[PDB]
Scaffold this active site. Structure first.
Site, PDB file in Angstrom:
ATOM      1  N   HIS A 195      -7.116  28.473  63.225  1.00  0.00           N
ATOM      2  CA  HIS A 195      -7.801  29.187  62.029  1.00  0.00           C
ATOM      3  C   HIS A 195      -7.312  30.240  61.923  1.00  0.00           C
ATOM      4  CE1 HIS A 195     -11.450  29.639  64.852  1.00  0.00           C
ATOM      5  NE2 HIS A 195     -11.479  30.615  64.198  1.00  0.00           N
TER       6      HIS A 195
ATOM      7  N   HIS B 231      -9.000  33.484  61.884  1.00  0.00           N
ATOM      8  CA  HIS B 231      -9.695  34.582  62.734  1.00  0.00           C
ATOM      9  C   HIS B 231      -8.988  35.204  63.827  1.00  0.00           C
ATOM     10  CE1 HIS B 231     -13.725  33.145  61.194  1.00  0.00           C
ATOM     11  NE2 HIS B 231     -13.394  33.688  60.481  1.00  0.00           N
TER      12      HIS B 231
ATOM     13  N   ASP C   5      -9.220  35.451  66.950  1.00  0.00           N
ATOM     14  CA  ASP C   5      -9.239  34.868  68.126  1.00  0.00           C
ATOM     15  C   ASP C   5      -8.274  33.548  68.390  1.00  0.00           C
ATOM     16  OD1 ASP C   5     -12.071  32.637  67.954  1.00  0.00           O
ATOM     17  OD2 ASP C   5     -10.764  33.403  66.452  1.00  0.00           O
TER      18      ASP C   5
ATOM     19  N   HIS D 270     -16.100  25.623  60.190  1.00  0.00           N
ATOM     20  CA  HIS D 270     -16.281  27.018  60.713  1.00  0.00           C
ATOM     21  C   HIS D 270     -15.709  27.831  59.761  1.00  0.00           C
ATOM     22  CE1 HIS D 270     -16.147  30.553  63.465  1.00  0.00           C
ATOM     23  NE2 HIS D 270     -15.179  30.483  62.861  1.00  0.00           N
TER      24      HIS D 270
ATOM     25  N   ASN E 160     -22.351  33.711  63.475  1.00  0.00           N
ATOM     26  CA  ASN E 160     -21.663  34.128  62.464  1.00  0.00           C
ATOM     27  C   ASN E 160     -20.834  33.240  61.792  1.00  0.00           C
ATOM     28  OD1 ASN E 160     -19.870  37.010  61.410  1.00  0.00           O
ATOM     29  ND2 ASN E 160     -18.734  35.077  61.128  1.00  0.00           N
TER      30      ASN E 160
HETATM   31  O1  LIG Z   1     -14.868  36.367  63.498  1.00  0.00           O
HETATM   32  C1  LIG Z   1     -15.736  35.658  63.775  1.00  0.00           C
HETATM   33  O2  LIG Z   1     -16.611  35.252  62.951  1.00  0.00           O
HETATM   34  C2  LIG Z   1     -15.790  34.900  65.063  1.00  0.00           C
HETATM   35  C3  LIG Z   1     -14.265  34.278  65.329  1.00  0.00           C
HETATM   36  S1  LIG Z   1     -14.617  32.320  66.018  1.00  0.00           S
HETATM   37  C4  LIG Z   1     -16.187  35.920  66.180  1.00  0.00           C
HETATM   38  C5  LIG Z   1     -16.626  35.160  67.450  1.00  0.00           C
HETATM   39  C6  LIG Z   1     -17.627  35.726  68.365  1.00  0.00           C
HETATM   40  C7  LIG Z   1     -18.579  35.075  68.961  1.00  0.00           C
HETATM   41  C8  LIG Z   1     -18.116  33.742  69.594  1.00  0.00           C
HETATM   42  C9  LIG Z   1     -18.932  32.794  69.979  1.00  0.00           C
HETATM   43  C10 LIG Z   1     -20.298  32.870  69.793  1.00  0.00           C
HETATM   44  C11 LIG Z   1     -20.887  33.993  68.908  1.00  0.00           C
HETATM   45  C12 LIG Z   1     -19.918  34.801  68.752  1.00  0.00           C
HETATM   46 ZN   LIG Z   2     -13.756  31.454  67.589  1.00  0.00          ZN
HETATM   47 ZN   LIG Z   3     -13.430  31.743  63.700  1.00  0.00          ZN
END
Ligand SMILES: O=C(O)[C@@H](CS)CCCc1ccccc1
Ligand SMILES: [Zn+2]
Ligand SMILES: [Zn+2]
Length: 225
Positions: free
Chosen positions: A83, A85, A87, A148, A179
């Site tokens: 996806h 984002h 990460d 998501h 989020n």
């Molecule tokens: O940009 C975003 O909304 C997310 C990337 S999946 C940030 C993930 C950070 C996080 C990961 C797991 C649970 C809570 C927070």
């Molecule tokens: Zn993530």
């Molecule tokens: Zn994400």
């Protein structure tokens, strides 16, 4: 045994063997004041390796390649981001500079270009509609529909029955939504069911963040959303 968030300094990456030919990589990164762990996948592809997602950042991804070189010793030739984002795509530039051909659905690539994230080089055909599936070397890619995010894909390794759910799938201990700014809440449960209906023989299900689980993780996610 699976590495936890307080055990991985930001900048370091750990590798965890899931079945052979299949590892998950774990890194850590800060997001709005707090540090979180994040998972990716590594799949042996003959004499090469297929990478599923970055390690959430340029420096982490560099550490990922170094750790892969140290523990596995085979070159990573291709990578797929699940996806848009950071990460998932944060670090594709380091991957590009390292000779890795990067991939993502056109949906993911344009969602990343508009948010200003790094953009995988190649577009993956055959996943524009919910339920679509395409094969990619040792794995199969599936687009279950918006969850998501509207572009989220899940990955399956047939020879290992490993289902990598990405951030559309939550680990067991997570009891809150968190989020979901970029999500389609109304469709999420429907997208997950599409996953359930599609890979019912899954033995390992890896969430985008947290500890591994089984198909056990899908209904749990629905129940949380
Ligand atoms: O940009 C975003 O909304 C997310 C990337 S999946 C940030 C993930 C950070 C996080 C990961 C797991 C649970 C809570 C927070
Ligand atoms: Zn993530
Ligand atoms: Zn994400």
């Amino acid at each position: 045994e699976y590495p936890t968030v307080s055990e991985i300094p930001v900048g370091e990456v750990r590798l965890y063997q899931i079945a052979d030919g299949v590892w998950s990589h774990i890194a850590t990164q800060s997001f709005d004041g707090a540090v979180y762990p994040s998972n990716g996948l590594i799949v042996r592809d003959g004499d090469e390796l297929l990478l599923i997602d970055t390690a959430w950042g340029a420096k982490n991804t560099a550490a990922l390649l170094a750790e892969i070189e140290k523990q596995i010793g085979l070159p990573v030739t291709r990578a797929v981001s699940t996806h848009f984002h950071d990460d998932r795509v944060g670090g594709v530039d380091v991957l590009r500079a390292a000779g890795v051909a990067t991939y993502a659905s056109p949906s993911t690539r344009r969602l990343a270009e508009v948010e200003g994230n790094e953009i995988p080089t190649h577009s993956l055909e055959g996943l524009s509609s919910s339920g679509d599936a395409v094969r990619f070397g040792p794995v199969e890619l599936f687009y279950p529909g918006a969850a998501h995010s509207t572009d989220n894909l899940v990955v399956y390794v047939p020879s290992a029955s490993v289902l990598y759910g990405g951030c559309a799938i939550y680990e067991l201990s997570r009891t809150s939504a968190g989020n979901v700014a970029d999500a389609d809440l109304a469709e999420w449960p429907t997208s997950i069911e599409r996953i359930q209906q599609h890979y019912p023989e899954a033995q390992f299900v890896i969430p985008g963040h947290g500890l591994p689980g089984g198909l056990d993780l899908l209904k749990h996610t629905t129940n949380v959303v």
